[PDB]
Swiss-Prot record, chain C:
UniProt similarity note: Belongs to the UDPGP type 2 family.
Protein name: UTP--glucose-1-phosphate uridylyltransferase
Top-level EC class as recorded in UniProt: transferase
Catalytic activity from the UniProt record: alpha-D-glucose 1-phosphate + UTP + H(+) = UDP-alpha-D-glucose + diphosphate
GO molecular function: identical protein binding; magnesium ion binding; UTP:glucose-1-phosphate uridylyltransferase activity
């Protein structure tokens, strides 16, 4: 298959932008209607073919792991059925969630997974960014596509998308080439919240990466970006243009918008919710 | 001020919101950026309650933690924020926790040792009384308590429904009730179009009645309620403004939007975004 | 007539340093004396004395203490025999455990003050959990906490348990104006100190108190040290000042499980006495 | 270098033999003087060269992980010698990973759950309620460390054993009647659970330490007609040579009350700072 077996997901220490909702519950457990962000993120991983998920965590984060694990008393009450099928249907049996503690920096959270991952290519996924399942085919596009491409060329993939205001993100330098959703083109560097006038593209790092086993040593020499730009010095790495829509639930308004969008699409209450929104707005 | 303690049963596990509540308490689901329990407690405080008793479960330390101070967190934030965050539980308010050993009537019983034989407020936490459609410091719980204190008559909040077939309606021997008013209730029929909302202000007299009080072998507070009734004058208080049942998925999704539009820093942008998108 | 001391308050919010690393991720109060955590002995002592309301003044990382006394669902499941019933009986049905968080408040005086809202303006017992009162060496249903409560009901005077120490240079020693105390006796104390030539007595403060409702306002008005620190000894000195305080002479033996050596000595002493393994252990001990 | 890089520690089951102490704290967190049993076991894995430990766990046991992680609030609270001691707990080059076991299904099944973590590689299996005495063997040269070096040389799995008086209480190996000296590895032709003394192939009991080849993986994947480690070991013997390794020094079974109380006293006598005193104390008192 693919040498990309593991997805490393850094679990937020404290999602301060979302206080106080996340003062005592992880932001990864904040819900989009009726499921926690991390359940969408894990299913995205799985749709791409990943079966091993390495959560890079902290002490106050047990509920994320319990969400995917079995909940004895809960299930007991449940028998005491659909929901029951559902709660045990959260993590497919062929999927394994692993945990390692980080006790700062995303590049640091990645390095922490080194020992679990080995000296192999890996996927890095940020948990507060949700790629829209209805807007693209997760089994074929995006992370799924970035991995197929990595297998084909051995070139790291870095998901990106066009954004209005560039100063707010980390922009990639694709030497001015235009990219269509779905394509991969070489990147020659990354610019941390560039100043509009000097920004390399309008292409923002989305929070999805498929990286060659070489970042590992680079991470040690080294944030992800600097080992990224160092990797770039050694090999080709490409920007992959995200297909569909993403939701950034790491910012309050982004989260509120996602809440509503997923609300309108809810399998059982979406139409009624949508109707209500229309007679209400 | 005779009523200083509010009992909040939050020890049940919340089914209708699965899978979101599998590993987190339903009481910590956010309405925008504040958990349901924060709105609830804020409501108690506004009414002058200074001691909140959570009748809980092993899995809900997140709720107490939300109200306690998060050291490492505090170690982290900033000036503006750092305030807002300690500020969750003001200094004169105490959150106490007792573990339940099922039913609301039994949940309230467990708090007896903490409350003592005193008048007590009973608050259902997955029901939100809208802070913008009422003045929570002057109305509803605030006032139902102010009236208990003035007259020692118990108060049970109710609001008019549509399908009275769908609900339990209090019997007020036919007296027309309007927002803001109270009038004796003689019981409930499952007589008026008024339903129990989930806020109760009860005389210390319910305790012994609650001890002497089931459907699934659960202790019903309705049962002690009617008992208190045959012993005394209990009044229905007509809720003012709007309530939000956040214990049902749709009701929760709808309050999320209503509150978002009213959000103090993001309400205007979200509302405009919504208006276009929708 | 029933006493008015209805609640015991147990400060369990601190992170116990002298016991590290053992207590690095577990409460010092959950350290076992053979096969039971220190806290169960302490709660049982409250119970033997008739207290049925216990207030733990805790911290976030200590949910295990409450879990100890609650029903342990999965465990009982996987338990369904003796263990089931032993385990099922750890906290009797008529005993209620309440918890309140100490939060930012530093100091023992603060810890006690935190329970005020649960206790009310009522007298209360204050129990430090790392000191274990030997259930074999005295009758906890009549002595010690049980007797200090009775003395407080008979005189209105707050009670402070003390015990005799050969070395006064290492303790909180009381001044009872040189009046002698025999076990079980309470006599007014006018202060608390001590070098040795100037010590007012050989009686050290053990860790148990039965205080009147008057400690409440005093505690709230106790002047802080930095960071709000309110010490209970300070509040105690003002109580002594406001009124009559007696020192009560402990019966039996105490185990200070707050220090390493003492927790070890305790573990051994309770092992030898274990209802099931006492004999075999004691013997194995004589052999070794 | 060795292909044996990972040690799997099954700590997921709930320890009934030690109730009620263990009602709400994991058995692995009980202290032998001033350290939890799991610290001793982790330190032993480290002495043997292991720098990757996989706990196969349960939800109610975060405390085991917190023990090795950074105790931010404590550290802060200490910020001297003790602060160091405290951080030093897990050496920076050693990593603890965790996986949850599904339905409580046995040690065999516990190891099996570590498969995705370890991969198709040889592993060390360590039962954490058995403590190998540090004072009585050189844990950096004998026992697990030796077992691992013999596996690297030969490629033969190593199952640790020690002589017992009563075989009916253990899983016993069959080495074809051949004597093993401490530190010696001898091929085993079978394993048997709790034999009646009259048919027992030896008086050498499985202690609880294993260094297994990557070939036990497919064997552990099989469902019996309860997945048992010894049954897997017996299937492996069928395919390949497996040796029993005779433990050096002394072991402590702290999975049973008496054994834990004895180990607590034995280690208190040896405590670095308090032993002399504690011992003296015990003499006068005994």
């Amino acid at each position: 298959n693919t040498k990309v077996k593991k997805a490393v997901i850094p679990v937020a220490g404290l999602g301060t932008r979302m206080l106080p909702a996340t003062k005592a519950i992880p932001k990864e457990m904040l819900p989009l209607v009726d499921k926690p962000l991390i359940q969408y993120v894990v299913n995205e991983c799985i749709a791409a073919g990943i079966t091993e998920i390495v959560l890079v965590t902290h002490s106050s984060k047990n509920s994320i792991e319990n969400h995917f694990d079995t909940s004895f008393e809960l299930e007991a009450m449940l028998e005491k059925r659909q929901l029951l099928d559902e709660v045990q249907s959260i993590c497919p049996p062929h999927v394994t969630i692993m945990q390692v503690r980080q006790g700062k920096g995303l590049g640091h959270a990645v390095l922490c997974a080194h020992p679990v991952v080995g000296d192999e290519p890996v996927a890095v996924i940020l948990p507060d960014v949700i790629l829209d399942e209805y807007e693209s085919d997760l089994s074929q596009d995006n992370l799924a596509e970035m991995i197929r491409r990595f297998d084909e060329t051995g070139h790291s993939q870095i998901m990106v998308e066009p954004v209005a205001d560039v100063t707010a993100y980390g922009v990639v330098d694709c030497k001015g080439v235009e990219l269509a959703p779905g394509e991969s083109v070489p990147m020659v560097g990354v610019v941390e919240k560039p100043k509009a006038d000097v920004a390399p593209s309008n292409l923002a790092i989305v929070g999805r990466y498929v990286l060659s086993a070489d970042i590992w040593p680079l991470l040690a020499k080294t944030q992800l970006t600097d080992a990224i730009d160092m990797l770039i010095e050694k090999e080709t790495v490409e920007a992959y243009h995200m297909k569909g829509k993403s939701h950034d639930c790491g910012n309050k308004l982004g989260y509120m918008q996602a809440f509503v969008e997923y609300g309108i699409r809810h399998n059982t209450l979406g139409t009624e919710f949508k109707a209500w929104l229309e007679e209400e707005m």
